Design a protein around this ligand. Structure first.
Ligand SMILES: Nc1ncnc2c1ncn2[C@@H]1O[C@H](COP(=O)(O)OP(=O)(O)OP(=O)(O)O)[C@@H](O)[C@H]1O
Ligand SMILES: Nc1ncnc2c1ncn2[C@@H]1O[C@H](COP(=O)(O)OP(=O)(O)OP(=O)(O)O)[C@@H](O)[C@H]1O
Lengths: 448, 76, 427
């Protein structure tokens, strides 16, 4: 976060060196037009886009039950297996605590995050403090972060190291300054309280990608916002369904129908069949040229259908979803079998899947505006107890569908049942165990 | 309402015996508070607030002895 | 028969104007004996045009019945219907002509043909029999039919008459643990009248904060009884009341209520039942009851510090507070403690209070449990509460592996006459 005189050192293609080069260049040139066309900005953009976000390793010391432990996480999928009381949730909260400081520094610098609660320190006599540390690797760039807290009653101090997160977040803010629709990483946490998030004010008119950055966890009002966002999408499609798009609808269909009936009629200068075909060709060429953006009704109808089909992918028993406008208020209508169902009348299991998939789709779409298919965005997602309110038939296919739908998102999942373990590769399995070593009980992680 | 009621006492020209009666009531309240402290947190808080208000009123009576602008003058 | 005993008691009461003569009457004692001998039981229930179910007749065993099925097979609807029926019985028992929960508009079937929804049920008390029908018509439909409550009211009358003469009369327990027990009821992050425990408390479970005050009072009474040294406890409480009155002479409504509480304390100390099931024995039974379900722990104690009470549990070599336990032990601790609390409050006369009668409905028994626990919970519950009827729904095959053949019920969907219908089959 400094200008610096750009010390030469040796030739390298590190992202940090490009960041410093751009900072040094900015301090001299004043015209923003030249800055927006500089080659240094292009190099920084390319390096940032090619890098793939993924966490690397984590270690825990004297936090809750865990005394000393270090884990290495895969880049695509990792699953933790254990019984009750083995600290499956503790790891997830540790990762959420670490990620909160990165979230905080993106909205505004020097903003505090989440600290350690006083009751989460280990209860042993000889303990003095707790520490959590982690590492983030952007292809070739490595950052680290430490969070610590001293036990109450002690008179020795400890501090946190926040240089890495501050430096990494400064790059994201700088690139966001000179790019119209720069993307941002995705971070989410679905705790065990989501069961009644879907189980259970002034009208919003402005949306932004920073709306999802207020909190790292999913609870309560997020569900309400999803409903308000969905109707906003539907009206956007309807507006674009009208206007000039209807004009091409009327001209092209009628002219085509004029040809088809004549061919079918075979009645009797060759009439005006050639001229009609020429007019149809001209209309088709104009319609094709008029397409802009995604070239399929811009990017509104395709977005709405993509969201609907994504939700329908996890519930094969349903046929279609529609947004009926009731006279008093709007409502969504499903269809199972030969019956029409309301969302309030759905079972608990279908509600959980509906909320989880809808929330993920909303977050991905909001954070990735430039991408043609927003589902490819990078990020990290944490899920606890994937086997809630699901019968064993659905337990065997949830993992592969989750991975296939979002292929570039790192997943951390904790499970409780052997049905899921039947469809996971050995590479991505970690098993927690309890072993008493040197007279002290401790937790270990063993690969299969 | 409070200002008019206070000006009523000035109109009646009550002597210092009223201050003595208020002091006696404050002492009785203090004794009740002491009894309450022995073998009701809301009651204790209310009694303490009433005792503080009575002490403030007694200090107002002392300032009346030291003289001040009459409530009649403020009323009109 | 029960009707013969009721008629005899009514005639004796009419003839014997004196209360003592009615109390000494053999008819009242015989009726009490018949009521004690009778065991609460629900033989069957018929459901017509309720939610997905179109027509169904179900028979339940006396000990335990478990329904197994996939998602969307109507397991929750059966539980809701039974809670609907039990609501009217509770309301009538609590007070005269108490209205109960009704069938909502959206509960009826969405099919165009259906015009009304009806639930019928039958309750058997040893040799006696009764039934109840509750019905609600579809919105915008005429020819509305009216529910029949004579059978239930005749059951409530005999209970009110029996409890009027005897202050130690037992009552049947009616509880229904829904999924809501998992949000914050399982968590801890948020004079007692026996009438409030049963009649004034709904079947749904929401908050367990009361359990803590009840345990505090039980511990205080046990400590006073065990340590003794009370001497004239009634006289001491009366002197405290007199001191409070003297202070009042020297917020007023609260002080008067506190004085009445002091008088009640003096009356309680003057009574001094000192029964065999004393406070110390109930405290030990409750603690050992909870500890039976959690073999990992060692002991549970109530520690007083900073002018407050906190629960301390020992696991291995580390002492933990209540809030530091995991979700799994939180659920079992909450459910078992709520089970025992109502049994103690409802049956203050039995030597062993964990023997009363009742009906319990539990949904999703396998929430937040590993298979090792899931393979022994059913036998633990049955052994702990012998004279209670349980209705449980589950879909985990591990639970099904340890259940007898006759107690299971498998739901299936079969297309008949071009219309999908639900069927119930035994192995
Ligand atoms: N301060 C502490 N000292 C010692 N042990 C603690 C402390 N705080 C928590 N624990 C331990 O934490 C354990 C529970 O940890 P945790 O909730 O992470 O595990 P889990 O059962 O796998 O998780 P979950 O059910 O929430 O998915 C308890 O058994 C308890 O012994
Ligand atoms: N009024 C209705 N008419 C027709 N079908 C309905 C109606 N209400 C609910 N259903 C159907 O009931 C099915 C199951 O929902 P319900 O609330 O009965 O859960 P359940 O099957 O009892 O619960 P669980 O999965 O916990 O066992 C839904 O798939 C829905 O199609």
């Amino acid at each position: 976060m400094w200008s610096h005189p750009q010390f030469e050192k040796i030739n390298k293609m590190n992202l940090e060196t490009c960041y410093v080069d751009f900072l040094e260049l900015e301090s001299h040139v004043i015209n923003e037009d030249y800055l927006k066309e500089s080659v240094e900005l292009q190099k920084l953009i390319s390096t940032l886009n090619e890098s793939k976000f993924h966490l690397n390793k984590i270690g825990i010391h004297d936090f809750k039950r865990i005394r000393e432990l270090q884990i290495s996480l895969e880049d695509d999928l990792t699953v933790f297996v254990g019984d009750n009381g083995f600290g499956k949730s503790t790891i997830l909260d540790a990762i959420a605590i670490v990620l909160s400081w990165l979230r905080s520094n993106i909205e505004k610098e020097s903003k505090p995050g989440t600290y350690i609660k006083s009751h989460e320190v280990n209860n042993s006599v000889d303990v003095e403090y707790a520490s959590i540390d982690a590492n983030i690797k952007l292809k070739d760039f490595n950052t680290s972060i430490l969070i610590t807290k001293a036990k109450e009653g002690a008179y020795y101090s400890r501090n946190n190291e926040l240089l890495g997160v501050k430096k990494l977040a400064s790059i994201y803010r700088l690139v966001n300054k000179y790019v119209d629709n720069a993307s941002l990483p995705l971070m989410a946490y679905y705790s065990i309280a989501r069961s009644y998030i879907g189980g259970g004010a002034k009208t919003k008119t402005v949306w932004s990608k920073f709306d999802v950055y207020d909190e790292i966890e999913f609870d309560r009002n997020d569900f309400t916002d999803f409903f308000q966002w969905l109707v906003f999408l539907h009206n956007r499609a309807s507006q674009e369904k009208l206007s000039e798009s209807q004009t091409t609808i009327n001209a092209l269909f009628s002219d085509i129908q004029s040809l088809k009936a004549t061919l079918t009629q075979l009645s009797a200068d060759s009439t005006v069949i050639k001229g009609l075909e020429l007019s149809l060709k001209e209309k088709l060429n104009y319609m094709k040229s008029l397409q802009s953006g995604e070239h399929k009704f811009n990017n509104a109808v395709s977005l709405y259908d993509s969201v609907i089909n994504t939700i329908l992918k996890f519930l094969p028993e349903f046929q279609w979803i529609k947004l009926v406008y009731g006279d008093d208020d709007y409502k969504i209508i499903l269809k199972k079998g030969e019956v029409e169902l309301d969302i309030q009348q759905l079972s608990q299991g279908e509600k959980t899947i509906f909320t989880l998939v809808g929330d993920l789709a909303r977050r991905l779409i909001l954070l990735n505006p430039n991408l043609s298919n927003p589902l490819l965005g990078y990020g990290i997602v944490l899920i606890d107890e994937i086997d809630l309110h699901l019968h064993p038939q659905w337990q065997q296919t949830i993992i592969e569908r989750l991975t296939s739908t979002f292929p570039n998102v790192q997943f951390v999942i904790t499970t409780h049942s052997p049905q899921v373990l039947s469809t996971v590769s050995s590479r991505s399995v970690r098993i927690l165990q309890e072993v008493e070593v040197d007279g002290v009980n401790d937790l270990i992680v063993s690969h299969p | 309402v409070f200002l008019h009621n206070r000006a009523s006492q000035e109109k009646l020209s009550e002597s210092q015996t009223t201050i003595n009666a208020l002091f006696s009531d404050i002492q009785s309240l203090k004794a009740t508070l002491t009894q309450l402290s022995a073998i009701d947190s809301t009651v204790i808080k209310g009694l303490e607030l009433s005792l503080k208000e009575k002490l403030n009123y007694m200090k107002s009576l002392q300032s009346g002895e030291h003289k001040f602008n009459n409530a009649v003058s403020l009323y009109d």
